[PDB]
């Protein structure tokens, strides 16, 4: 069992990395929002000039 | 090491080339004077050794008007000075003038420049040619160039982006005469041809772009986007890449049937593009909406043969296949029986570029679609009726005869269009 | 990457002897000490690797950040004010914002592409009903 | 071994099951993360009855949750002790049943049950030796009242030799919050009588009355009602998990309490229940416990046991005691109150003793009794059903989904036959 | 995953929608621009994927006056610019104009937009439609819209929050005519219809809110509060939730009988709201108080089919059960014979929201009560008497006749009202 519990200890670590891989996906959806706010409003002001 | 040569002949070709080359320069970051401020561009441009870049384009005309506009415009330092060929006398809406009288003294220079450009290339994929068909030098020089390049090169593919007249909105009065003639010459010399009727793009500029007074500049910007979306697979990285040679292997069932029409989506102004998400699910549905077609033709009047979709942006391959099944199961889109699989899809990662001072909005995902369908037979039928009505009483025929054109050539062009119509009619039926 | 993962069979052949010859436990204590041995066996994995009332959440908008918008048209005098645009003129203040918030979160149900149907092959095994030992 | 699998349906069933699992986890010393934090060895000897062993050494309930809307499951997952449930075991629809028995038994349930039956089959296949099933559902709601009956039917078809227990909440004429309650109540009872091995009915009105009179607390809540129901549910199966002087499982209880196959409706109760201020004054012994046992207002049903006669009754004691005093108390009570006890079955009381009292209490009792008085609920439900059905009110929804008046007539006739043969033994004499 | 689409047709519908949408935006914290400064808005709104939210609403009218006010006000940025469909020429209090002449030139675009909106949704619960009867566009486009929707979509629930003319106070002279045709159209196409006539709301304001000059702004807010109370169980967690589908399954004894009236409580001004405790025991009596009905009808003259009431705030489930028992024990409130139990009660945790500049006070509880009763026959009877009075001398008939409507269209509507009155009278008797 001592070697056993060492094995399942690794799956828990593999769980943590998978959650972080989901976290970077949250960072990915920042891209469209970042590219939306500052710069899509400017394209509405180009016609105002 | 893959290149492509673009040929601009006639006023329409030149004025669409101005916009397309502005878009290419903006996309690749090259300044108007040719310098790059501090390897993918090799498809369109060529290095001078230290600094500026010279496009692989040649401009042809007989009127020195639009050429002199380029030679003194902001792009005067970009193009090679002695590949902006200009003539002295205009063809003046006469097909025989640009094919028998005043085109023979100028076609020699264009061939030499094309040979010089090709000798510099190493992986030449093919040729792009833009020309207005309802005109004299556009149809006259366009036929001669294709005829010469055929016997000069052979197996190099040629892509033509022509502008046929609208069903009811057109300028010239003799354009049914020369539109028929040029189609005869390009049918057996062009591998892929695209229909770009003017009236269709006017309506697209209205409904989507909220523009009440469109102009030729607005239309030419739409075509440049289509060209860029078509050729971005050569010069940008993507999950699924498609070459020029991988166009005429999936869209042309038979060697004669290669006249096709295009569409683009999404087309929308920025004032209302940000009230909705523009997901891949619907932008692929809009591409098949008949009102969004770039040629004034109704796809509901015939079957489909083969459809090509080129996605660019951040599309996911799973999402693409999920939307395609919806199109297949839709009951108002009908494919021909002998084509079970009808889609060839390519995906690119580069998002579409936006030109300052334009009218379009910028979106995360864009699809450009090229479809070959039997509905393209109606534009030939309606074009034939006008020519028959005029040729019954033989109007304007004396203008063409006196320039060296035989009387009997008008009949031969008429007969082969009938053959093409019969070919479409016999191929559209089921087994 | 675990070092204990690389231990392999055929190393189980003779390897020393954990209990030395001079400290042999008597039979009496081995019988007595089975309580901890069973206790250790059961909860060894549980302590090594295995380790009310509703509450309202905060309102999304803070008082200091309403950012009231200026109307598109240019009115000049209160005379031309119309009752149709009375809505939304006043920005909310501290008093009237709701004290408690009870929204519905659908994150968990925004999953499960669908239900599952067992497209498999039995693999049941029969454990018998009476004193398993006559089963196969 | 001899494990039992839990399945729940509907909002009421889910709320009952969540509190039941909190009570079970508190009894077995399991934190909301599935890690044992207990102290005694007995708390882990028989943990496999209710729990499964997963990787890492954590425990998970073998519970199956069924519903038609995701709201209840999303709430129970976010609630406390919700992390124990396996995500795969969640099966639900997307449209809802709409308090319509026809909708929840013929249109949506018919398509949805495939997955839940698959999950139930997997859980019952993975177990060592199946003992039975226990189900918590409501008889007044659409998805519960429909899918519970349908799933009982198919599970009885698949496993004819098991034991099936149902903890049903029936509507009362006083506190009614659904206008279509009599219809689906009759339709559910008609199917339940033919399939359920054991059925235990619970009354919301009785629960509120208990909270107002015995506990004497100002503001009762569904949490407290679910707590009472969960304690009652754990009482019956405690002796299966812990050793005692006289252990007796569900099958033995059924054999002792059911004289005839169709008379398997029981009314339950719990003891002791004392207000917060009077605990230190009362003495906790077997006499006081049996007082609060046989006391009428401690019952969880609106039926009054003194309006009929007891057929058989059973008492489950927990904690340390002496069997002699328990037997003497039962004999004395039955001898003196012979008027309320049927005569042709003398010595009609069963007793069981468990050695583990509830946490915080030295002694506790759970009471299950089969009395002829339960026919009052059936009579009042039938009266409401026939009053609403003689004019064909609210009937077109049922008739528009493959159901006809023939099923209503058959269900009404079956319930009336049940009532008649159940009253027969109230006046039958030897 | 739960959605509902709101349709506002007519000036009354638009002006009610303005108040309801400002209320919803304030309730969910969305700024009028649409940018927020967990997922509860999904019932009424839709995330665009980055930032802004857009309502699931469509605005219809034939005149530009009211719509242009919205497109210029502070709430302009919230709506999609295209989902505000407006015409050019008004119906001018003519039902025949809005159902046969000019209403047919707008229905196609509205239906296309409705299809586009419903494609986005996934769990569409139903539709909310707001329209006044005594106008051409409210009656003409409403009938056509519901008729088209009933065959396009089918089994989806549709709820009509309709405003009938008052027994004696009205602004038009021909509204008895176009009222009957609306009833004939909606009786066979609307799942649930709510009576919200203006005079009853006028009395409530003067009696309770201490307002001596009530304007249309005050009345619309009460309707918004009623809608919010009705639909709060979809987007706020509660002890006993009720869906949109859980109204018709419980409040409709027979398919023909689905006309019902509402009541809301408490409605107390803030200057006197703190002189009483507003207990759940007493606010439930104000809900059943005969003169507090939002429709000018007398419940004391008839029996009750069923009654649905929804509580929000900090109510206790044991509190309401005692109140229902007290109401049942009351002798002046008599239910119908074949309904032993007739109450359906819901409870929600979220208290009502107060809007700045409003009239209602801030309270910890509220009740919204929707009841079905035999007494609703009186409004039909009085409108029938008015119609009989005016139709006797063929008054105003030529206006409707000249717009493509037949002469005999009135007789069938009259017979329909007679049949409806007969059905109510037959149902109301005992067994
Ligand atoms: N899309 C597009 N088409 C154009 C533009 N300018 C001209 N055309 C088309 O060109 C057709 C006539 O040809 P011309 O513009 O006269 O040029 P051409 O074909 O070379 O004939 P010539 O006048 O002899 O030079 C018209 O029917 C137009 O449809 C343009 O800027 N954009
Ligand atoms: N509650 C309420 N009722 C209104 C409001 N505006 C108009 N009404 C009622 O609507 C009735 C007439 O219909 P309107 O909505 O005014 O006119 P319409 O529906 O646009 O029809 P057309 O005038 O032909 O375009 C009047 O008798 C009013 O009682 C409002 O803002 N609130
Ligand atoms: N004991 C208890 N009963 C409840 C609870 N919630 C609802 N109920 C009862 O369940 C009935 C409504 O059942 P319903 O939710 O429609 O059942 P479903 O259709 O299967 O979801 C009501 O009459 C309530 O008395 C709860 O938390 N505890
Ligand atoms: Mg109007």
From TrEMBL, chain A:
Top-level taxonomic group: Eukaryota
Compartments reported by the entry: Cytoplasm, Cytoskeleton, Flagellum axoneme; Nucleus
Part of the whole protein covered: 101 to 149 of 447
Protein function: Microtubule inner protein (MIP) part of the dynein-decorated doublet microtubules (DMTs) in cilia axoneme, which is required for motile cilia beating. May play a role in the control of meiotic division and germ cell differentiation through regulation of pairing and recombination during meiosis. Required for sperm flagella assembly. May play a role in the assembly and function of the outer dynein arm-docking complex (ODA-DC). ODA-DC mediates outer dynein arms (ODA) binding onto the axonemal doublet microtubules.
Protein name: Meiosis-specific nuclear structural protein 1
Family from the record: Belongs to the MNS1 family.
Annotated source species: Tetrahymena thermophila (strain SB210)
TrEMBL record, chain C:
One Gene Ontology term from the biological process aspect of the record: axoneme assembly
Source organism per UniProt: Tetrahymena thermophila (strain SB210)
Main localization category: other
UniProt-annotated location(s): Cell projection, Cilium; Cytoplasm, Cytoskeleton
Protein keywords: Cell projection, Cytoplasm, Cytoskeleton
Claim: Cytoplasm is one of the keywords in the record: yes
Protein name, per record: Uncharacterized protein
Family of the protein in this entry: Belongs to the PIERCE1 family.
Cytoplasm found in the keyword field: yes
Gene Ontology CC annotations of this record: axonemal microtubule
